[PDB]
Design a protein around this ligand. Structure first.
Ligand code: HEM
Length: 441
């Protein structure tokens, strides 16, 4: 019948908060999930949410007629900077559907074919960097993947060159971002520099570059493109929010993906061997064609399996549109919040079998077999990732070229250490790459 909701122990007015005293809250919540099962309530001073981990409950939560996207505490801080951009707007905010309609054509297959050459530009810069390292040198994986993904969104979206590969520290734009992503995550564990405004020069420079300057990219649609429903273009204030949104969303999760993918490949030599052999076979030309990337079937499986284990945007939040009952057992009142613990969803033994921790790309051999709402690294419904096909094309292309051009060594026997900034990264992951001395075009 009507069930009492599991909940970890509460400590007076502190509630459950002393159980999340960590820089790694998602990983801590995964342990609580292992303990309490498919749903638990979590209270902190003043606020309450319910963590879901099973495909059966999340499939219900994914019913857009009953639950909509909620801005979690973390997203409410990002909203200070990203405003009512796509990622930090409520669905019922006018600018949400408006920008969605305006910007969606920028991710059509075709706009995607139109991005490929610029993707290859940044990818060649990555490969050339690693070709040019001396014998005594190693690669800082997440740091270089971030150089690539930031430059890729810069160039494809905004025809702006961040020139991240001409810098040996992260781009100044990144360095701001990283501090605000962590401080928003830390502000949650507070029961009782963040203001220091840096990226607005960058935004000005992106718009001004375009002002001067034959482009048909994301920025063009932001600037000119009007919403078929209402006839309205985006206003200036919202355009600035969208630029910021796409610069942060357009690079951070993709970089984490590539990093985890390389991690899992160097830990699984037989998977690496097969992935490498596909890359050599398919990529027969000096630089990859759009069509060839689509032929990298096993590399795509490798990426989906990295997202299964460590989805780089690991949670999303929902709220009950009306009073409702969840799972036929848990009554919810209007406004009650739910969080989808994606890494936990992706370990549901009832869906995946009981080797959920193993890195097996062949799970994705025939994807239509995978139940609905079992695999959700890109979110849900109308508020799902708009950039999904962009991210996967970029990553497939890049991983393909890496595997074609180098042999990789896990030279420090790296121990996985996952840093959380509301995206996930394998912090400190380093490798050595031995060139196969295949020329570029
Ligand atoms: C593997 C890489 C990526 C992952 C795992 C990922 C994941 C996600 C997830 C889980 C959401 C839903 C957020 C929520 O429900 O609160 C989302 C939304 C969003 N993502 Fe992605 N993302 C990736 C790459 C990208 C890229 C490359 C772009 C842009 C080029 C992008 C742009 C966006 C935008 C604008 C939204 C808000 C969409 C809306 O609500 O209308 N993402 N993403």
């Amino acid at each position: 019948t009507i069930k009492e909701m599991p909940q970890p122990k509460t400590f007076g007015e502190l509630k459950n908060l002393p159980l999340l005293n960590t820089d790694k809250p998602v990983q801590a919540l995964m342990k609580i999930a292992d303990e309490l099962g498919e749903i638990f309530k979590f209270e902190a001073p003043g606020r309450v949410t319910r963590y879901l981990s099973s495909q059966r409950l999340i499939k219900e939560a994914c019913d857009e007629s009953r639950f909509d996207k909620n801005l979690s505490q973390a997203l409410k801080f990002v909203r200070d900077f990203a405003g009512d951009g796509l990622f930090t707007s409520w669905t019922h905010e006018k600018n949400w559907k408006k920008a969605h309609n305006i910007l969606l054509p920028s991710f059509s297959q075709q706009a995607m074919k139109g991005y490929h050459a610029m993707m290859v530009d940044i990818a060649v810069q990555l490969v050339q960097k690693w070709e040019r390292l001396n014998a005594d040198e190693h690669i800082e994986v997440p740091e270089d993947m971030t150089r690539l993904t930031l430059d890729t969104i810069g160039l494809c979206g905004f025809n702006y060159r961040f020139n991240s590969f001409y810098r040996d520290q992260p781009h100044p734009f990144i360095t701001s971002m990283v501090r605000a992503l962590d401080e928003a995550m830390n502000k949650l564990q507070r029961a009782n520099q963040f203001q220091e405004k840096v990226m607005n020069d960058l935004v000005d420079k992106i718009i001004a570059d375009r002002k001067a300057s034959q482009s048909d990219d994301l920025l063009t649609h932001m600037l000119n493109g009007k919403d078929p429903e209402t006839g309205e273009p985006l206003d200036d204030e919202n355009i600035r929010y969208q630029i910021i949104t796409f610069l942060i969303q357009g690079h951070e999760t993709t970089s984490g993906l590539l990093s985890f993918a390389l991690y899992f490949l160097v830990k699984n030599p037989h998977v690496l061997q097969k992935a490498a052999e596909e890359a050599a076979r398919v990529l027969v030309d000096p630089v990859p064609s759009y069509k060839q990337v689509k032929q990298l079937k096993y590399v795509g499986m490798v990426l989906n399996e990295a997202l299964r284990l460590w989805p780089t945007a690991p949670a999303f939040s929902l709220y009950a549109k009306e009073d409702t009952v969840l799972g036929g057992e848990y009554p919810l009142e209007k406004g009650d919040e739910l969080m989808v613990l994606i890494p936990q969803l992706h370990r549901d033994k009832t869906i995946w079998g009981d080797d959920v921790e193993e890195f097996r790309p062949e799970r994705f051999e025939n994807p239509s077999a995978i139940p609905q709402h079992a695999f959700k690294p890109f979110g849900n419904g109308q508020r799902a990732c708009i950039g999904q096909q962009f991210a996967l094309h970029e990553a497939t292309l890049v991983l393909g070229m890496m595997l074609k051009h180098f042999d990789f060594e896990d030279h420090t026997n790296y121990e996985l250490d996952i840093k959380e900034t509301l995206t996930l990264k394998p912090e400190g992951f380093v490798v050595k790459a031995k060139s196969k001395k295949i020329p570029l075009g």
